Symmetry: C3
Subunit: 394 residues, 3 copies
């Protein structure tokens, strides 16, 4: 049996069989050209790989920073797909339990490296928008496109899913919303004869005590999902690359993601001036699209097959990891380094997170779906996108 | 098959058969006295028709403005019933699909003409209270009286409804609540070093971009309700007036509604002083009672018959039209004329709209009902009515 | 048939049969030593009864106030259990209907006497925290420990409850939340050119008009629960003490609770300084633990027996009585005496009450349970406890 993310990781794989240059005339370079054809050429997004050496040469030549920022997003779009592919090529050699533990802590690898490299460069605002923008993308854009495109193709058939597997995710997202609401309400307590230095050290001290509780709720979620109630999770039912070759490519792709994520962070303020876009719009709308490349194109294919237990397991499972594992890990790392970071996102950002959890919880509680459920979730994503397009706050 | 509003439009009809003055001694004036008896005398609210010529004569004689405002509400109470009756006397000559399109854009005719005539006379506050007061009336007063009066008469029987027909309405009302919450939160961003002229042009510019998205969500709702999923809407199953006579009375009643709606708008500030009532209380409590005259007395009769699919189709269907067709149409008309109008209702008004959608969504999600569900919705309407009675804000 | 609280009141009873000192050698003092062994020694919390005469002697000797406050909480912990035991020893002599009326108005006896004795001593803040802390304790701590400890012991069996008996409680808690939200939003209307004396008399005047509506919704709840829909409430199925002996002990225990509740109120400000704890933390966390002694240890035992209709009837039934009978009764008593008290708890307290009702309503709407539902409700209680531990607001 496979997990819900093993099924959806091989959705953009293209079978590449040259068998003319490599197979027949060669005798010695047979294994080296087989690993290279499988990993590099073996995808549907292989036209974006020349954007990786283009951004490195433009860095060491002196091209202006809006050109580097444009090419370093097209480079990370196939790299986030290969890392989310080579991990499931290790799950055949490790098993569905241990493979589900490497997938639960390294599923969102691009959203994790950006949120740390922007944290160490004192850009705490860019950390907060990109982590919020990855929760709203999975709840509204990835989930809305699945129920709308899979609801027009299957308009004459019957569409059902299991409620009990997806209700655990909305319980944890409401525990995470409480950890964002309460630092926001402390900052509106200025009537209590306390200065600005008193209210700011209270927001920082409760946000660091909340992050320990949020990590305990995610460790217990993994025991639920992998061992105690596995029976409703492996209801979905071979590796090509050898193990020690697949371990070497995974270290190689991670250093190139961590290299191109430095170009995104260092060239985001000047790319905002020359494009006349706010820094809040680029970080919350455009930048989470790079990470959700194979999850977004893997939950839609399993909606045309009317398997809506896989579309919900990818969309809701990746938003619980951002909200309760990647957000409270950033607070603990800032606790060690000594950087003032709390769970206060803002009044306009908390109100968008509140409605997005409530409208998703009412949509998915009868166990059936049609195309009108998936359109309301799309149009709520454009309302959020118009609001941060206009909000050019200097 | 009929719609849910065809069944509930003929609920206040009284059969008037004189057959002494008209039928026997006359020979020539037979058709003219038959249309006049059917339309004018053929209702249960025919004692309120002398209030229409009384308000016109008191206008041209010089009677003080609190007398004109009292009589111009009693005049519009049978006129809103005749327009909501003569349209369904055109649905027998047009069909259930085309007749459902004329009913979906002209169902709330009194709330539409008041909201435009008050807009062109620079009374933007009276527009915002009367459109909010028509959503809260349908969700709490019309829906609460149905489930309470139909839950005492049927206390020994079993009361059920179809959830899937009514869940589409609560998805759109949560999309509409997001378009009211976000202009409210921009006005609390005064910490971002922006003046009052900067925050006010941001509220106006996002409210005009939201209104295009709100109209697209209602056009797709009509395709859902009339053509794709008609099968759950015509589950409910002859015209008297000729077609070209019924078209002539519909133009005549609309001009008299548009005449008496001018008297309501022009005499609402002095009627507030002489009665010692706030302008917010008259517009949000008393004034939506005039429009919901046949919907309120048509959803209760079909609760004594234990047909709760018709009580929900009238109450929830008329609150989606106000919230997503009549509210965003007023923003587009003010965009053309050049009147500064946004979707900001206020902090006390948005908090009442938020709880009224949540408590109605939890009440109607098991598919059954009893009298205790309908009493909580009534007592939440009196809590809102006490709050705006005391709030006399100069 | 018994109620849901008759079953859970005798959960801490210990059978005490000496039969050596009393029974054999004595002939005259047989009935007096039988009532004394049944009431005093007949419990599992009988080691805390020496804390009652210790707090009285330390009062009349001159011991410092942090010592009296510590002993007067250990005294009230078995006294709240005996009063919640001797009332059900009167229900066998009165019946399940009249006995359910004495239990519905005297179930929370310790939270009622503290909220009045602190009201008459001008400590209105201590009244508002202890009444909020008894709603949050029953929804999160009592209900979360039941579903977690009864979900590990019954992990191989099937856990179900009846939704329709518990959905009435969440309808009334949302009617009560609206009565707390609207006085909070009037205090943020400072832009309307009104002074501080105008906004404060508007909060007081609507809070006294809301309390009449909240009491009418609870009287109708008792008619629902006891007479009209009793059939779903007595689905659960002998007294030892004579009636006129049990009436005499009930008057005696009430005067000692009302005596030790004076020591808690008079020694709470100096016990806050010498312990370096805020007055908000003691009143909202530590002090409601004293009242929920037999309800908390009576809903867990019936979760090991897989009878989750009794665990929900005790937890949710005691939070509706606090929120809609004990909170609006305190406003009416302050209306008579002339003490300025409204339903404004505060911005940080209203946001905790809002999320606690929503996360409890989504958890209990499929009719089944497991251990992961009960852990999220526990960890939401610690997030609230960390927030008021740090909030030391002078």
């Amino acid at each position: 049996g496979r997990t819900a993310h093993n099924m959806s990781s091989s959705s953009l794989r293209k079978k590449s069989d040259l068998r003319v240059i490599q197979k027949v005339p060669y005798k010695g370079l047979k294994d080296f050209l087989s690993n290279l054809q499988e990993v590099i050429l073996g995808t549907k997004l292989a036209i974006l790989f020349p954007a990786i050496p283009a951004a490195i040469i433009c860095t060491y030549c002196g091209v202006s920073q809006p050109w580097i920022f444009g090419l370093s997003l097209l480079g990370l779009t196939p790299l986030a797909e290969r890392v989310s592919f080579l991990t499931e090529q290790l799950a055949f050699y490790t098993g569905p339990t241990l493979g589900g533990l490497l997938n639960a802590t390294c599923g969102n690898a691009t959203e994790l490296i950006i949120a740390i490299l922007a944290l160490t460069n004192n850009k705490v605002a860019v950390v907060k928008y990109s982590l919020l923008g990855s929760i709203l993308s999975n709840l509204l854009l990835v989930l809305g496109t699945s129920l709308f495109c899979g609801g027009i193709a299957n308009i004459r058939r019957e569409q059902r899913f299991d409620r009990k597997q997806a209700d655990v995710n909305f319980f944890l997202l409401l525990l995470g919303f409480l950890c964002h609401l309460l630092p926001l309400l402390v900052g509106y307590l200025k009537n209590g004869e306390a200065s600005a230095a008193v209210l700011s050290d209270m927001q920082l001290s409760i946000s660091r005590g909340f992050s320990i509780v949020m990590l305990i709720s995610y460790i217990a979620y993994l025991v639920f999902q992998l061992w105690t109630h596995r029976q409703l999770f492996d209801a979905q039912e071979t590796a090509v690359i050898s193990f020690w070759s697949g371990f070497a490519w995974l270290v190689g792709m991670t250093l190139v993601i961590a290299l191109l994520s430095e170009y995104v962070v260092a060239t985001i303020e000047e790319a905002s001036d020359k494009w006349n876009l706010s820094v809040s719009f680029i970080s919350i709308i455009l930048l989470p699209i790079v990470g959700n490349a194979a999850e977004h194109a893997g939950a839609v294919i399993f909606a045309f097959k009317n398997k809506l237990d896989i579309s919900l397991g990818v969309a809701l499972g990746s938003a619980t990891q951002i909200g309760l594992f990647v957000v409270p890990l950033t607070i603990i790392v800032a606790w060690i380094l000594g950087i003032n970071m709390d769970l206060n996102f803002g009044p306009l950002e908390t109100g968008c997170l509140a409605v997005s959890i409530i409208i998703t919880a009412f949509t998915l509680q009868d166990g059936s779906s049609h195309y009108m459920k998936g359109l309301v979730l799309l149009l709520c994503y454009f309302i959020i996108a118009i609001c941060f397009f206009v909000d050019k706050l200097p």
